[PDB]
Design a protein around this ligand. Structure first.
Ligand code: MG
Lengths: 67, 114, 55, 104, 55, 98
RNA sequence: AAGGGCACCACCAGGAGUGGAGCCUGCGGCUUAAUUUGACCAACACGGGAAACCUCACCCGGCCCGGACACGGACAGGAUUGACAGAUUGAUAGCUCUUUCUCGAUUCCGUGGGUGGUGGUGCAUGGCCGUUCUUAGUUGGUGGAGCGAUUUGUCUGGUUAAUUCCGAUAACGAACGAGACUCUGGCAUGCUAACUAGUUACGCGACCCCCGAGCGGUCGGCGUCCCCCAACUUCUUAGAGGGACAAGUGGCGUUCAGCCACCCGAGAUUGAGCAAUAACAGGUCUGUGAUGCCCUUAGAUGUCCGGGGCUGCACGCGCGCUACACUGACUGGCUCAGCGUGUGCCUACCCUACGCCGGCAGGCGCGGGUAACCCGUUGAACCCCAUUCGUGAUGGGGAUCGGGGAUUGCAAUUAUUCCCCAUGAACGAGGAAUUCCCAGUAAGUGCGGGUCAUAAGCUUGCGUUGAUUAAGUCCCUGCCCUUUGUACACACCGCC
């Protein structure tokens, strides 16, 4: 035994709290502060990521980068 | 012809099916004194006979076990539905069957007899 | 690991592709006449298959 | 329809193959169908030579397993139809038939 | 030290186990249940789905 | 086991449609020969049947390279209340025409 | 210890060799991160073990759970599953790091409990195989000898391949093994037959013919089940029947068992397979969903993936291949086989004809064949007939090595294999020793199968050409039987 590498650390999820990444205003006006994934199997429900430099579909893995 | 397999491979494959079916039936019906399997093959359908010591045991309540085996041997070997028939036949003079006596000996020794 | 490397090895040939139809062993394979049976499993099942020792 | 049928019999044991051919010729002769003589195809010997030992240690003894396949041809050529006259084939286990028309 | 360089023993008859040796000694003269004997011993879903998706 | 519910329900409904189950011992086989339209893998069917056998709703037999799971009476009612069925729907092994 | 008997894994008489040389391959050793491991007559081309990856069991690294089920937690306000980009990594392993999405009770965590393992133990075992031993040995019943265990039968002798028989005879009658048996080869102009085998006869042709041959010769040219448009099974195939029995004659013998020779005969001993009571701490847990116990089980000895290794080289040994030459090598022409395979459940991979391109290896189209239908009349080699070489390490040998060109594969480097042009090493018949063998045999000589995507210096078969010596013996080496001795009986690997 005695592997030169120290034991690899397995990734642990952040156990993130509730999403709530879309807000309402003046007694309720829908406003999606996130982006929407346009794929047809993705549908109108799921939402795009909000990376610092790209937009990523969590299911379809489509990318939309702004440069 | 092109779809058909050669006669040599056909007969080897038929023997292969006999061997596998016999081994599966041995393992499954060993505790019922399964003596052997005899398979009559016609180009239309396949008829197989389980020669056993206890037909009343190899076929379950209302023939549940035998029809269950028929379904099993359909699924494994790809036989089309309703093209294979399983029959159970009592072995004549079971005392002369080498496999049956060996099975009864195994049952006795498992029970713990000297 | 994940899907793209677990069985990604090209196994369309060689010893690793073929296996014993009885005991899943890769040694002593008899592929003649489409047997695909082991050197030892064939000696076990030859009588059932129909191969008889004549000479 | 005018029809001519070639029936091929194939098996492993000569006794039952000869029985299942001879009764076919004998049955058709009573029904007055022109039966060409049963042609004996050369027998096919599948030979497998394998080491007897399951390990490798020994005096290098080999087993010569032999599987013989015997094949017979029977031709029925009647001026009239043949399928309606012959609807039974009287098979026993082991022997396999294959119907063929003379066109093939 | 009972073996040569390769590892085969130089005295095959000299048993290396304290429990048993070359000869088979019988436990209690072959007595008890799980033992050799003695002299005394010698002497339908498809239609249900079809009606489920009906309404 | 990371087996999705669609795969689970398809395998269970096959097991209740016919009280038998046959699968090759091949974890790397992409699809089961039966109900390959569901795109379930043979690994999933093997592990589902293994988990069924562990709690005893099915009995497992093995040929050369094939499993032969036979559904049990204890499994009949478990599948009944898992698939929400009345006690009238039975496998063909239980009833044929009667 | 003595006396008998047998055996080409004993000799004799010989033959071909091995050990001498080069190389392939397998062991030991050395070396190595690993160079995985078993086996030491009856291991060492054996594990069907010809390993590029896989195989793989070993090493260097990195993923995954494919840890069932039970209990308790955590949890739709999320148990949890994946993942684009950058780093990071060999990796386009979201393996991890920043990162926000996505997945919906399947999972996750802890405690018990599984499960798998080419991990160990073949000295815990089953099965199978090898050997003693394919030697001729082994055992009841009844009767006799005995107080018993036991013994006789199962033997002085002759004879046989054989306790195979005959004879002697307190034994008589048997049984297993041997034999008999099955398969295979040798003969049937006798039988049944055959457009997936053909043969004769006949008809059209094609050519040599013309001297004219003319029922002339050759034709694997085309045909005559193109089913109305010949017969036949000799050749071929494969079924049933026959045939060979020491049957006939002479000689030897208890004149018995049998032995020798000769005639008629195809054959007067064709090869195998099977194979007793038992024994070998023989070999295999690396054949298995054969298996006990032990070991490991999440940083895995599970499983997968990448690379390497199994090949590694001062040396020793074993099975082998090629040679040392003229009984030859090269070049060309002529001319003859038989085994047997051939398109795939998974499974990806078949045998190849024909035409075209290239010098070759090969490449490109176009078929046929699941097969007595196509390869294929298997135009095989040796050999035979002509050319050159000329006793010279030489036109023998092709080892070592350079360059180039193709094929298979995901991948050819540590050269897979193949082709082409170059260098041309030992080797001039091999010490002590040692192996195999009695007739279609040794040996020369090629062709199939297995291994196989690519692969034969291996093995298993087949055919071709085709001998010398021997019809004996216990000298050597062993084995068996009898007598004998024994303080052994786990049986000399003993006891002491
Ligand atoms: Mg050169």
């Amino acid at each position: 035994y005695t592997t030169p590498k120290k034991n690899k650390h397995k990734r642990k999820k952040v156990k993130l709290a509730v999403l709530k990444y879309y807000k309402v205003d003046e007694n309720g006006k829908i406003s999606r502060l996130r982006r929407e994934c346009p794929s047809d199997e993705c549908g109108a429900g799921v939402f795009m990521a909000s990376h610092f430099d790209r937009h990523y579909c969590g299911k379809c893995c489509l990318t939309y980068c702004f440069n | 012809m092109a779809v058909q397999i050669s006669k040599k491979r056909k007969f080897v494959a038929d023997g292969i099916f006999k061997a596998e079916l016999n081994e599966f039936l041995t393992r499954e019906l060993a505790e019922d004194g399964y003596s052997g399997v005899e398979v009559r093959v016609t180009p239309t359908r396949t008829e197989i006979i389980i020669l056993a010591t206890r037909t009343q045991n190899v076929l379950g309540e209302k023939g549940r076990r035998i029809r269950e085996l028929t379904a099993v041997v359909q699924k494994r070997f790809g036989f089309p539905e309703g093209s294979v028939e399983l029959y159970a036949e009592k072995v004549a003079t079971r005392g002369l069957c080498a496999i049956a006596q060996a099975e009864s000996l195994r049952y006795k020794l498992l029970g713990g007899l000297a | 690991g994940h899907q793209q490397l677990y069985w990604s090895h090209p196994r369309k040939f060689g010893q690793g592709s073929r296996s014993c139809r009885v005991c899943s062993n890769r040694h002593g394979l008899i592929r003649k006449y489409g047997l695909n049976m082991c050197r030892q499993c064939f000696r076990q099942y030859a009588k059932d298959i129909g191969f008889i020792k004549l000479d | 329809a005018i029809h001519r049928i070639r029936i091929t019999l194939t098996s492993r044991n000569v006794k039952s193959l000869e029985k299942v051919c001879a009764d076919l010729i004998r049955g058709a002769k009573e029904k007055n169908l022109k039966v060409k003589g049963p042609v004996r195809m050369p027998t096919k010997t599948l030979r497998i030579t394998t080491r007897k030992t399951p390990c490798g240690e020994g005096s290098k003894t080999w087993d010569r397993f032999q599987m013989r396949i015997h094949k017979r041809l029977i031709d029925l050529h009647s001026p009239s139809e043949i399928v309606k006259q012959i609807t039974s084939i009287s098979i026993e286990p082991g022997v396999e038939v294959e119907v063929t028309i003379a066109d093939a | 030290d009972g073996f040569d360089s390769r590892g085969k023993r130089e005295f095959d008859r000299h048993s290396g186990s304290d429990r048993s040796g070359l000869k088979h000694e019988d436990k209690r003269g072959g007595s008890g249940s799980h033992n050799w004997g003695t002299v005394k011993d010698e002497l339908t879903l498809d239609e249900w789905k079809a009606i489920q998706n009906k309404d | 086991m990371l087996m999705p519910k669609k795969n689970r329900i398809a395998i269970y409904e096959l097991l209740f449609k016919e009280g038998v189950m046959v699968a090759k011992k091949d974890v790397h086989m992409p699809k089961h020969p039966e109900l390959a339209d569901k795109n379930v893998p043979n690994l999933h069917v093997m592990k589902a049947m293994q988990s069924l056998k562990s709690r005893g709703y099915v009995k497992e037999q093995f040929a050369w390279r094939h499993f032969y799971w036979y559904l049990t009476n204890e499994g009949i009612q478990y599948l009944r209340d898992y698939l929400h069925l009345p006690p009238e729907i039975v496998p063909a092994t239980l009833r044929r025409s009667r």
